[PDB]
């Protein structure tokens, strides 16, 4: 079976950014439903089970470019009393629909904390080594939910 | 007077 | 979108 619209595809992968492996493992996803970064999904289109390959995915087809609007300055009083507010530390605010908005602390200057709401890989080009482990048809429930079980 | 935090640990 | 990177 080939990778295609409405297939649930299982891959084993290694994610490299700038010559360093950042993540490694296995995932399954419903193909053609915006469940996987588009560059990788494009590289997977039409592949057979058992196929292995490498794929370079520029930032625009991966987690997207770095959005300057994602960088903001907030007061230190915005953070929990106990928290260590340091570069790299992660937290979340809430969007207008009540959902979590993760952020990373970028810099702390006295009372001014610069945070970044961007995906940590936004604006980075990715390199994948991929193996297609399994391809199957989605169940109706998976199509209704929009994701692999 | 201390402001209600709008940033949460996770 | 996947891969989920924390
Ligand atoms: Cl999925």
Author numbering:
A (entry chain B): 1 to 149
B (entry chain H): 25 to 34
C (entry chain G): 27 to 32
Article sentences:
Peptidyl-prolyl isomerases (PPIases) catalyze cis/trans isomerization of peptidyl-prolyl bonds, which is often rate-limiting for protein folding. SlyD is a two-domain enzyme containing both a PPIase FK506-binding protein (FKBP) domain and an insert-in-flap (IF) chaperone domain. In order to improve our understanding of the mechanism of SlyD and of FKBPs in general, we set out to analyze the kinetics, energetics, and structural basis for substrate binding and inhibition of SlyD from Thermus thermophilus (TtSlyD) using 15-residue-long unmodified peptides, which we reasoned would be better mimics of natural unfolded protein substrates than the traditionally used 4-nitroanilide tetrapeptides. In total, we obtained five structures of TtSlyDFL and three of TtSlyDΔIF at a maximum resolution of up to 1.4 Å.
Next, we tested binding of an S2 mutant peptide where the sole tryptophan residue was replaced by alanine (S2-W23A). This peptide retained the ability to bind to both domains of TtSlyDFL, albeit with moderately reduced affinities. Furthermore, there is more than one molecule of TtSlyD in the asymmetric unit in several cases, which for TtSlyDFL:S2 and TtSlyDFL:S2-W23A display substantial differences in substrate binding. We therefore expected that a peptide where W23S2 is mutated to alanine would bind similarly to the S2 peptide bound to molecule B in the TtSlyDFL:S2 structure. Surprisingly, the structure of TtSlyDFL:S2-W23A revealed instead a third binding mode where F30S2 and I31S2 are inserted into the binding groove. The S2 and S2-W23A peptides both bind by inserting the side chain of P29S2 in cis form into the center of the binding pocket. The binding mode is the same for both TtSlyDFL molecules in the TtSlyDFL:S2 structure, whereas the S2-W23A peptide binds in two different ways to the four molecules in the TtSlyDFL:S2-W23A structure: one similar to the S2 peptide (molecules A and C), and one in a different but partially overlapping fashion (molecules B and D). Two peptides, S2 and S2-W23A, adopt β-turn structures with a cis-proline in the i + 2 positions. However, our results speak against such a scenario, because both type VIa1 and distorted VIb β-turns are observed in our TtSlyDFL:S2, TtSlyDFL:S2-W23A, and TtSlyDΔIF:S2-W23A structures, which strongly suggests that FKBPs can catalyze cis/trans isomerization of prolines present in (at least) both these two types of β-turns.
